Amino acid sequence: MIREERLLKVLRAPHVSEKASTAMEKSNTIVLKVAKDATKAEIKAAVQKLFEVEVEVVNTLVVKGKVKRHGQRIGRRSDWKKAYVTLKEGQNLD
Amino acid sequence: AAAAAAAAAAAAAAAAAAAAAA
Amino acid sequence: SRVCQVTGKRPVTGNNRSHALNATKRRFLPNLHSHRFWVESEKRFVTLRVSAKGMRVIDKKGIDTVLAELRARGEKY
Amino acid sequence: KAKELREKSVEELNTELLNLLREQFNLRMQAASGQLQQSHLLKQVRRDVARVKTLLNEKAGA
Amino acid sequence: AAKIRRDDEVIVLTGKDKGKRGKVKNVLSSGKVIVEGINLVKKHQKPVPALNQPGGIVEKEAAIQVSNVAIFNAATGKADRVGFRFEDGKKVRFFKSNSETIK
Amino acid sequence: MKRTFQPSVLKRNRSHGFRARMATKNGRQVLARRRAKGRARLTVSK
RNA sequence: UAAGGUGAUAUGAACCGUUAUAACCGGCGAUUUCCGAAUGGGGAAACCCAGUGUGUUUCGACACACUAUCAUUAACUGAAUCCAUAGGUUAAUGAGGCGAACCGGGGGAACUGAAACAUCUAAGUACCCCGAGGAAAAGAAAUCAACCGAGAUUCCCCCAGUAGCGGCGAGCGAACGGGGAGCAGCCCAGAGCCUGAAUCAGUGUGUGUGUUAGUGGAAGCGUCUGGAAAGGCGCGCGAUACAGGGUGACAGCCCCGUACACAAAAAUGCACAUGCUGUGAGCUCGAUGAGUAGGGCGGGACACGUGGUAUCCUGUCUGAAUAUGGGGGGACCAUCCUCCAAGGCUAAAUACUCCUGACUGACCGAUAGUGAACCAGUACCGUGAGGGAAAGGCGAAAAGAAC
RNA sequence: AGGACCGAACCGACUAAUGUUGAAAAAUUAGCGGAUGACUUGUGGCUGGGGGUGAAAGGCCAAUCAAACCGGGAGAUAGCU
RNA sequence: CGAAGGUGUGCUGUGAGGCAUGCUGGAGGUAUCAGAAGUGCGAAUGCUGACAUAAGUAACGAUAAAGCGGGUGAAAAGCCCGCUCGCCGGAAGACCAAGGGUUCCUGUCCAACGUUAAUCGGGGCAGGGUGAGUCGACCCCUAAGGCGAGGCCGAAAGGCGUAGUCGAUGGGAAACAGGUUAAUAUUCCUGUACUUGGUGUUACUGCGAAGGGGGGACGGAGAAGGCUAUGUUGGCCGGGCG
RNA sequence: UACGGUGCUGAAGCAACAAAUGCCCUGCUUCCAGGAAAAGCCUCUAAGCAUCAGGUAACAUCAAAUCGUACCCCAAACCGA
Ligand SMILES: [Mg+2]
Ligand SMILES: [Mg+2]
Ligand SMILES: [Mg+2]
Ligand SMILES: [Mg+2]
Ligand SMILES: [Mg+2]
Ligand SMILES: [Mg+2]
Ligand SMILES: [Mg+2]
Ligand SMILES: [Mg+2]
Ligand SMILES: [Mg+2]
Ligand SMILES: [Mg+2]
Ligand SMILES: [Mg+2]
Ligand SMILES: [Mg+2]
Ligand SMILES: [Mg+2]
Ligand SMILES: [Mg+2]
Ligand SMILES: [Mg+2]
Ligand SMILES: [Mg+2]
Ligand SMILES: [Mg+2]
Ligand SMILES: [Mg+2]
Ligand SMILES: [Mg+2]
Ligand SMILES: [Mg+2]
Ligand SMILES: [Mg+2]
Ligand SMILES: [Mg+2]
Ligand SMILES: [Mg+2]
Ligand SMILES: [Mg+2]
Ligand SMILES: [Mg+2]
Ligand SMILES: [Mg+2]
Ligand SMILES: [Mg+2]
Ligand SMILES: [Mg+2]
Ligand SMILES: [Mg+2]
Ligand SMILES: [Mg+2]
Ligand SMILES: [Mg+2]
Ligand SMILES: [Mg+2]
Ligand SMILES: [Mg+2]
Ligand SMILES: [Mg+2]
Ligand SMILES: [Mg+2]
Ligand SMILES: [Mg+2]
Ligand SMILES: [Mg+2]
Ligand SMILES: [Mg+2]
Ligand SMILES: [Mg+2]
Ligand SMILES: [Mg+2]
Ligand SMILES: [Mg+2]
Ligand SMILES: [Mg+2]
Ligand SMILES: [Mg+2]
Ligand SMILES: [Mg+2]
Ligand SMILES: [Mg+2]
Ligand SMILES: [Mg+2]
Ligand SMILES: [Mg+2]
Ligand SMILES: [Mg+2]
Ligand SMILES: [Mg+2]
Ligand SMILES: [Mg+2]
Ligand SMILES: [Mg+2]
Ligand SMILES: [Mg+2]
Ligand SMILES: [Mg+2]
Ligand SMILES: [Mg+2]
Ligand SMILES: [Mg+2]
Ligand SMILES: [Mg+2]
Ligand SMILES: [Mg+2]
Ligand SMILES: [Mg+2]
Ligand SMILES: [Mg+2]
Ligand SMILES: [Mg+2]
Ligand SMILES: [Mg+2]
Ligand SMILES: [Mg+2]
Ligand SMILES: [Mg+2]
Ligand SMILES: [Mg+2]
Ligand SMILES: [Mg+2]
Ligand SMILES: [Mg+2]
Ligand SMILES: [Mg+2]
Ligand SMILES: [Mg+2]
Ligand SMILES: [Mg+2]
Ligand SMILES: [Mg+2]
Ligand SMILES: [Mg+2]
Ligand SMILES: [Mg+2]
Ligand SMILES: [Mg+2]
Ligand SMILES: [Mg+2]
Ligand SMILES: [Mg+2]
Ligand SMILES: [Mg+2]
Ligand SMILES: [Mg+2]
Ligand SMILES: [Mg+2]
Ligand SMILES: [Mg+2]
Ligand SMILES: [Mg+2]
Ligand SMILES: [Mg+2]
């Protein structure tokens, strides 16, 4: 069991997209953006005791950020783990 | 924008031993 | 290393000269041989690697004197 | 604030901090939205994270 | 420390607007003050579609250094350099010439 | 023609990399030189 | 300390405080993911994988702590072989690694010089390797002279490019002695006697003594030019401050600042005193550092290269003496003089700025200056070691030229 | 069965034109030899410079080789320009 | 009321050279004797930075090859569509390897970049984009070697080397078919399967190993035998009567 | 319908012959140049044992990470400026 102090840090924001705006209705899935030290335990216990909702199974990946050039000098945005969280039958977020 | 200014190719000493004078 | 366990006789370097007095870079090697030493005050055989000067200082300065000094100086037998 | 929070328990702060973390995480989840039109709420809540989490070590093991 | 305060009423030694007073609006980074009604200059402006501005020649109030201004004295009709005493232990500003505290 | 250099990171980073130049002796006499100029790309780790 | 803050290009949104808990500065702390000596095993650095004693547990799995390695001290265990022995298993302080110059050691060259070149010089210089400190080394007479003496070590100026050495060529180079800076002498090879005794090496404390933030600090107004007076032109004032820094151009009196006067809850150096922690000066004396001194044998360090060579160091077999001796006084001998080797300790004077503060400078002012005044040991180039750039100026504040 | 033959991919580089501040700092085109073997090849470990490796050509060891390349004594030295 | 610098003129010393002054330029120059010099450019096949020269010449990176209608626009020889016509098809096709680091996909945008124009682009700019018990790496195990406490050896660093612990390109668990977005999918979805670990119970009661053995476990050539991936034809089904 | 798309339906789904350089084949034959190790697994035992524990014979389970995943891949995206 993951303690609440470690649990409460694992999220930043939900993630707006077209594939979020398809996976919300046509397959009922949600698109997190978690911290980089997050495993399937630290999101399967983290969608549950943070919205008081349930979960079917979780999936993630490690998006590597693009390369930006502000001015004439190079720049590298921070990487960020994108989590796909499938919700059970009979679930609906706030 | 801007650009560089290239130089200094390996110019192969510009010749073989062409002028065989012997 | 070619280092005598008693004297501290480290190898040094000189120049091998000649009848025409030339110059090169030689080494001088100390005279090491392995040896076993009887002791009665411990009643055993102690192994040692020792110079040729060491194998005659060991019959004057007492065997157990050197065998006690080598515990203190820092070079174990 | 710490001159007020200094006279609290060893264990009452270990509910105070979790309540601050709950509302901090609420503020971080609303920080997704383009609705959270208060800037300094997040930073002052981070400072209240700081003072509490250093009084935690200033009492628990000092 | 900056003996010219914020809400004080200062006068201008030299510049395009010497002689006239003002009630100091604020002070910028390294001492530059914005006299409310003195450092006046026209400024052009492209109309912006953020915050709903139509564009115009906005006349905002510009900046001027500390060494152009000085605190006006209510008593002698001119300016005065300002000094520091320690009255009651309080570091309090007070006038150099005429020897009497201002607040 | 096959050029001067046909890359293979699986050997490049163990025959030039940081732990390779830390294992020997005089690699600690190249890592003891690159900081004199202070190289921000210290060695050939990516 | 305080009326304005939230580092910058880079504005803005949204906020906070005014009688001092806004910020900013200083001192002590708590924080300190991961890699790196990396130290739990490993590993293409920033990752991968565990083991153990122990606290939760919605019994899914968690959060903490530790574990290299030798050295050292052990406690214990421990076989060939019975008591005993190597080895093994735990503890605990030390250490490793990095860093510029500088010092001390252990190894060690070349083109060049001689118009070639081997002996020589280039030189114990470059370069590696070890080890240590802020200083290091060396050291308290087996040292010189010359019948008169001096009185440890180092360093500076001389003696002097002299006397010497040298294919007596190139070239190298003393010393005795004199002026200086600067001075401190001790102790074990040992018994006793004052026995806990002067000193000595850490502790904390008081006083100054700084260092780490700070505070005040003189005096000037009007006219003409022009964008503007800080200017010229009048009349003053201040000055233990007229050096510099900026302000719409040259400012002692506009503004920070200096001369001057002050300041610390905390830390901390550098001294006397302190209660200590631990070690011990003072007399009678005996006893004077043996595989060593010198020599046989090569050798390299003495300016000193085979020289007619003293001195010291040592790889090799030798090898004594012991207050009556023994070394030295430039082969060697005799006399005389002087000194007690074969063990330690020890400050300044000197050498050095990677880094810190303050000033100056007939030093630079952008193709200079450090490679770099600008986001540079970066871009670009080489697999790599390593090399290595170019690139400041609007104006007074952007007042950046709306329509 | 074959260091057998003819001939693909693959190697290899013999002949000729083109190309030689070319498309390429060694190649295109058209013909050519080996082509179940002393072969060729993927990727990976090993060999250090008076040294390696070499069916041994003084060829090769990063387009450089009768001693690679990178710093240093280097301001080697040059009686010649 | 105009300093240094540039510029033109006007005088002037036997000269290097000065004085004076119109113009630009908007903050410093500087007497006179004196002092110290990184103190004077035509070179050096010098070195940087700029502009000429050939020159509006060569060349435009295959001799596979393009023509046309429509649209976008200020723009079309290439950009989108559509029809012919060419060309590859053991490649010039598809998926992956070692490699590369946003090139993939839309919304724009044309200055520079494409040996042209440019709406277009692998170009700028803004956003979107990778999902696993099964594929692969990590991980269990070793080869060649590498590291390597001890130990042995070496002036010192170090050098091999024992036990070990490292080392893929090989040895060991697993699974597929269909649909989907502008982009991924054996990973998402219905479908249906499979393995490997601790668990709690059900009856069964020899497990125990750093050890013992069988296995994993292996070269080259040819030769057949049955077979499918695929290919062809017929039967069928649907469309058509050119 | 957004004339780009998509939603909703859907018969036949057989046979024969041909056939590998793909499978059995990690096989067979036969020749000499005579053709890896270790683990997962199969299995037997001692130091150890207790009527325990562990053991496969069942099944409800609970679990099975982290990282790679887009794109080109004999190329306009790698090495050749
Ligand atoms: Mg020599
Ligand atoms: Mg003040
Ligand atoms: Mg001013
Ligand atoms: Mg290598
Ligand atoms: Mg800021
Ligand atoms: Mg570690
Ligand atoms: Mg491992
Ligand atoms: Mg390691
Ligand atoms: Mg020579
Ligand atoms: Mg020579
Ligand atoms: Mg010569
Ligand atoms: Mg000393
Ligand atoms: Mg005397
Ligand atoms: Mg003042
Ligand atoms: Mg002695
Ligand atoms: Mg002697
Ligand atoms: Mg002797
Ligand atoms: Mg002698
Ligand atoms: Mg001799
Ligand atoms: Mg003596
Ligand atoms: Mg002595
Ligand atoms: Mg300039
Ligand atoms: Mg420069
Ligand atoms: Mg590179
Ligand atoms: Mg060939
Ligand atoms: Mg030929
Ligand atoms: Mg051909
Ligand atoms: Mg053939
Ligand atoms: Mg053949
Ligand atoms: Mg030959
Ligand atoms: Mg070559
Ligand atoms: Mg060489
Ligand atoms: Mg050489
Ligand atoms: Mg030199
Ligand atoms: Mg030269
Ligand atoms: Mg001028
Ligand atoms: Mg002029
Ligand atoms: Mg002018
Ligand atoms: Mg001006
Ligand atoms: Mg000036
Ligand atoms: Mg000159
Ligand atoms: Mg010129
Ligand atoms: Mg000339
Ligand atoms: Mg020239
Ligand atoms: Mg030139
Ligand atoms: Mg030209
Ligand atoms: Mg032309
Ligand atoms: Mg022509
Ligand atoms: Mg022509
Ligand atoms: Mg032409
Ligand atoms: Mg073409
Ligand atoms: Mg073309
Ligand atoms: Mg057309
Ligand atoms: Mg065309
Ligand atoms: Mg088309
Ligand atoms: Mg065709
Ligand atoms: Mg293709
Ligand atoms: Mg990009
Ligand atoms: Mg694209
Ligand atoms: Mg173009
Ligand atoms: Mg155009
Ligand atoms: Mg496009
Ligand atoms: Mg693009
Ligand atoms: Mg995934
Ligand atoms: Mg799934
Ligand atoms: Mg091995
Ligand atoms: Mg090794
Ligand atoms: Mg070792
Ligand atoms: Mg392994
Ligand atoms: Mg593999
Ligand atoms: Mg494998
Ligand atoms: Mg697998
Ligand atoms: Mg795709
Ligand atoms: Mg077995
Ligand atoms: Mg076979
Ligand atoms: Mg078939
Ligand atoms: Mg079929
Ligand atoms: Mg017809
Ligand atoms: Mg793909
Ligand atoms: Mg190509
Ligand atoms: Mg090329």
Q: Which residues from the 23-62 window of protein chain E have CB within 7 angstroms of nucleic acid chain G?
A: 26-27, 29, 32, 41-47, 55-57, 62
In chain A, whose CA is at the least distance from the CA of D14? A5
Do A12 and D21 lie within an 8 Å CB cutoff?
Answer: no
Query: What 3-state DSSP class applies to E88?
Result: coil
Query: What 3-state DSSP class applies to A83?
Result: strand
Q: How far apart are CA E63 and CA E98, in angstroms?
A: 30
**Nearest Cβ partner of D32 from A8, A13, A50?**
A13
**Considering its fold, how many domains does chain D have in total?**
1
Sequence length of chain B is 22
Residue labelled with tokens 């052009």:
E44
Q: Residue C27 CA to nucleotide G121 C1', Å?
A: 24
Report yes or no: A44 and A7 within 8 Å, Cβ to Cβ: no
Q: Residue A94 CA to nucleotide I211 C1', Å?
A: 64
CA distances from A13 to A81, A86, C62, D30 (A): 11, 16, 85, 8
Q: What is the DSSP string of D27-57?
A: HHHHTSSTT---SHHHHHHHHHHHHHHHHHH
Q: How far apart are CA E36 and CA E23, in angstroms?
A: 6
Distance, CA of E101 to chain centre: 20
Distance, CA of D23 to chain centre: 9
Contacts of E68 (CB under 8 A, 6+ apart): E12, E13, E14, E15
Kindly report the CATH number that applies to the domain delimited by A2-94: 3.30.70.330
- The data reach a resolution, in angstroms, of 4.3
Chains A and E: 3 or more CB pairs within 8 Å of each other: no
Show the beta-strand stretches assigned E in A47-93: 57-63, 67-70, 73-76, 80-86
Residue labelled with tokens 């981070």:
D46
Contacts of E47 (CB under 8 A, 6+ apart): E53, E54, E55
CA A78-A83-A86 angle, 5° bins: 170
The half-sphere exposure of D10 on its side-chain side, counting CA atoms within 13 A, is 4
Query: What 3-state DSSP class applies to F9?
Result: helix
Report yes or no: D37 and D30 within 8 Å, Cβ to Cβ: no
Q: Is the CB of A63 under 7 A from strand J?
A: no
Find, among E92, E40, E90, E97, the residue nearest to E72 by Cα: E97
**What is the distance in A from the centroid of ligand 73 to the CA of E22?**
70
**Considering its fold, how many domains does chain C have in total?**
1
Burial of residue A30 (CB within 10 Å: 0-12, 13-18, 19+) is: buried
* Residues preceding chain discontinuities in chain C with C to N over 2.5 Å: none
Name the residue range of residue D44's domain.
Answer: 1-60
**Cα-only R_g, chain C:** 16
Helices (H) and strands (E) in chain F, counts: 3, 0
Name the residue range of residue C54's domain.
Answer: 1-77
Do D31 and A13 lie within an 8 Å CB cutoff?
Answer: yes
**Considering its fold, how many domains does chain F have in total?**
1
Beta-bridged to residue E91, according to DSSP, are: E86
Find, among A49, A41, A34, the residue nearest to A81 by Cα: A34
Report yes or no: E102 and E84 within 8 Å, Cβ to Cβ: no
CA distances from C47 to C4, C37, E20 (A): 13, 6, 106
